[PDB]
């Protein structure tokens, strides 16, 4: 079949509500997607929903002849990495620990899928809490609840469906656990030190209340260090530090969902390294191709936890070998070419450009925020927001909406300053058309 | 790193309880895995836990130069197929419908992971039931329960953790929904027409009881057409036909979990095609590389179900493009070379060989059963079973245990009769050593 017929063929079998183009797999490159139908090039600030670290067809992977052989060798088959090991797998794991590892979290576990990575993090926490309870003469049936935030997005699976609360179409009509949910004390425009502290104290009040009223039953607290789909909602390090302390007071683990924030986007390997808070478990995915968890800190206090006992966690494949080989090579490019620092430099620049926009359009471009390359701004009404996205589309710039009123930028770690300019230029163009 | 160091390197980051070999990705072929450490060749009746349809490095994929280009092109990147379409994706989907499609189930949906495929099937059923309830003046909060069997294995995720009940280490200490579970009236040795019917009626009694006592609240019934991990437990078509009728009487969908049984292993595309029972939804995975669901029959009776409304079901990637391209080529080999029929022919043969074993070792080789290439037998004690597996390992034959006392065969659809003989010969060898 032919590019112009892709939508017709798919449309026979599935709901076909994605983008209006057909990806040219060979001709897309860097920060540009190519439409196989028209040949048109689209500036990509979307990156497969922030899941691509280097953009399409990065030269270091495309030109590497030894890599082509390794990738091919891994792609022809799909071994069950859970029980059948290989050199290809071992190199991925050791380069993961070197480039993304945290010496406090030596336990690695791999799975296909972001939601199922968060889920294995929760499963780790449920087991930990039950056994810790048991070892302290508390009933081991206790320890089955997850403290989480409003506007959190953690996945669309059995357990994450009880955590995710953004658009109601994601969770409506699906069975949930009744788990304690608390307000998200994220930063807003026009709120100074005291007003922020007051707002956090209110979330902390709610957190402690939950801990006290379901005694020994809350296994952990999960959070995105910056809420993504919820609307690029950022939190002061102060908030998580209080949360960390409070999790310890009540013998709960703190888990961070870094599936969106992870792997360099914020300017460090993980966002948490900038908030100066130590998690017990971290869930990762998207940019890392394979998903999974890093665990340690208090997890090791329970000698027979889920990473020490066979068959507590498992999936058939244990992650996709091809993903593992690609991610390995991706991680080597990130390290060899200092892409974390490039994300800080270029994130300072994108942020600055959005400050200029906010100044030039004060009533329209609201709350320019960002950490590293992870930036957004808001519009007054959701109708404005949707119009700005359509306008950018017509000008061949792909961005992502979030929430009621947010436009988000998810550029590749390799975005150039010229490319950022091209995106901002397109926004300047579209703005008078929306007002 | 080097093959002899794979276990050491992995062992720093993860629990390392899999097989004792390092897979040679290039030199393994057909029904044989090669140990990269020793060069030893292992007869493979395990197939990455039944997830490989053609064995390692099948000649039709290895020699195909045009395919190498397509696979490479797909493997260099990991697009989000959920919103970015491609020719590569469209060919996979159309060849899936042609080779594995059922005209009653036109709705296809793809996801990475077996558990999450079953989960999307359940999510479809929960939505369907709530909205059907609503349209008939029943409360839409009702419809949140899943009827399922003892010894069922459906995955290790949020929802499937409430369904899976095999070894307690899979589910212990993880939060569950209280869902109605019923006995599995599978065939055993020495039970004729009447004794079987009596046993089914008892399961049916339990099924109806559950339906009547949680009115309008059971969204669906899930089953494996042949229970795999539970111990290759087979059911008479009569049982599912009564279940089908009973699901309709109470307005519940019948979902089949064909993740293990699927894609040719039983001699047809799906096992259900042999039981002459029509499911409303089918969950597939393993051999298909991409996982997902086929849906139709009563699902279409609810106009605004999960396949007609945007954003009810989703994952970031919508399945792995590389898996999709490989599976496409796999499906073409299955079709072009009549591998379904080859599975019937060679499954009749393996089955026959196990009948001979049962005769020669009547007190030891218990209950030789099988459908297509999906066969097993049992041993008297679990200690015998584990010893036979160790003995086969020493003789370089890989098989899979199941349950308390079962050895299962999961050969590639391409297994030769000589290879079956080699497996049986190894079993004959090991048996006197175990007694
Ligand atoms: C997307 C994401 C996930 C879910 O990932 P999937 O691969 O779609 O299952 C979980 N948490 C966050 C913060 C994410 O952005
Ligand atoms: C293995 C399998 C699944 C679970 O598949 P995963 O890929 O490991 O999540 C579900 N149901 C059955 C019958 C299976 O055999
Ligand atoms: O299901 C969705 O809303 C997409 C979720 C997601 O990954 C995101 O947009 O951040
Ligand atoms: O977790 C397990 O027991 C493996 C599950 C499985 O896929 C099987 O063995 O059939």
UniProtKB/Swiss-Prot annotation, chains A, B:
Coiled coil: none annotated. The gene is lat. It comes from Mycobacterium tuberculosis (strain CDC 1551 / Oshkosh). 2-oxoglutarate binds at residues 156, 260, 408. It catalyses: L-lysine + 2-oxoglutarate = (S)-2-amino-6-oxohexanoate + L-glutamate. PANTHER family: 4-AMINOBUTYRATE AMINOTRANSFERASE GABT (PTHR43206:SF2), AMINOTRANSFERASE (PTHR43206). This is L-lysine-epsilon aminotransferase. Pyridoxal 5'-phosphate binds at residues 114-115, 260. Its cofactor is pyridoxal 5'-phosphate.
């Amino acid at each position: 079949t032919t590019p112009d017929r892709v939508h017709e063929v798919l449309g026979r079998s599935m709901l076909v509500d994605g983008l209006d183009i057909v990806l040219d797999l060979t001709r897309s490159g860097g920060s540009y997607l190519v439409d196989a139908i028209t040949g048109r090039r689209y500036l990509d600030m979307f990156t497969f929903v922030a899941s691509s670290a280097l953009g399409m067809n990065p030269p270091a992977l495309v030109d590497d002849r030894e890599f082509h052989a390794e990738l091919m060798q891994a792609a022809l088959n799909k071994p069950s990495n859970s029980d059948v090991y290989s050199v290809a797998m071992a190199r991925f794991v050791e380069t993961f620990a070197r480039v993304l590892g945290d010496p406090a979290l030596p336990h690695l576990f791999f799975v296909e899928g972001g939601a199922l990575a968060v889920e294995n993090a929760l499963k780790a926490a449920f087991d930990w809490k039950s056994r810790h309870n048991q070892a302290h003469g508390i009933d081991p049936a206790l320890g089955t609840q997850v403290l989480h935030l409003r506007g959190a997005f953690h996945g669309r699976s059995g357990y994450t469906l009880s955590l995710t609360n953004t658009k109601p179409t994601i969770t409506a009509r699906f069975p949930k656990f009744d788990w304690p949910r608390i307000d998200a004390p994220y930063m807003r425009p026009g709120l100074d030190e005291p007003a922020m502290a007051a707002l956090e104290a209110e979330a902390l009040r709610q957190a402690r209340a939950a801990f006290e009223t379901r005694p020994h039953d809350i296994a952990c607290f999960v959070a995105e260090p910056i809420q993504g789909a919820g609307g690029d909602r950022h939190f002061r390090p102060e908030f998580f530090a209080a949360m960390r302390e409070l999790c310890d007071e009540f013998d709960a683990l703190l888990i961070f969902d870094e599936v969106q924030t992870g792997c360099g986007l914020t300017g460090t390997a993980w966002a948490y390294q900038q908030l100066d808070v130590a998690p017990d478990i971290v869930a990762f995915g998207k940019k890392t191709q394979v998903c999974g968890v890093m665990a340690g800190r208090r997890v090791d206090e329970v000698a027979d936890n889920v990473f020490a006992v066979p068959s507590r966690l498992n999936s058939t494949w244990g992650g996709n070998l091809t993903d593992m080989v690609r991610a390995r090579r991706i991680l080597e490019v990130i390290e060899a070419e200092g892409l974390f620092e490039r994300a800080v430099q270029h994130g300072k620049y994108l942020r600055a450009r959005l400050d200029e926009l906010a100044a030039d359009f004060p009533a329209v471009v609201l709350d320019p925020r960002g950490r590293g390359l992870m930036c957004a701004f808001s519009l007054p009404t959701t109708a404005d927001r949707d119009e700005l996205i359509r306008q950018l589309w017509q000008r061949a710039v792909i961005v992502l909406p979030a929430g009621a009123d947010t436009v988000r930028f998810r550029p590749p770690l390799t975005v150039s300053t010229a490319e950022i300019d091209a995106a901002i230029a397109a926004v300047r163009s579209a703005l008078p058309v929306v007002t």
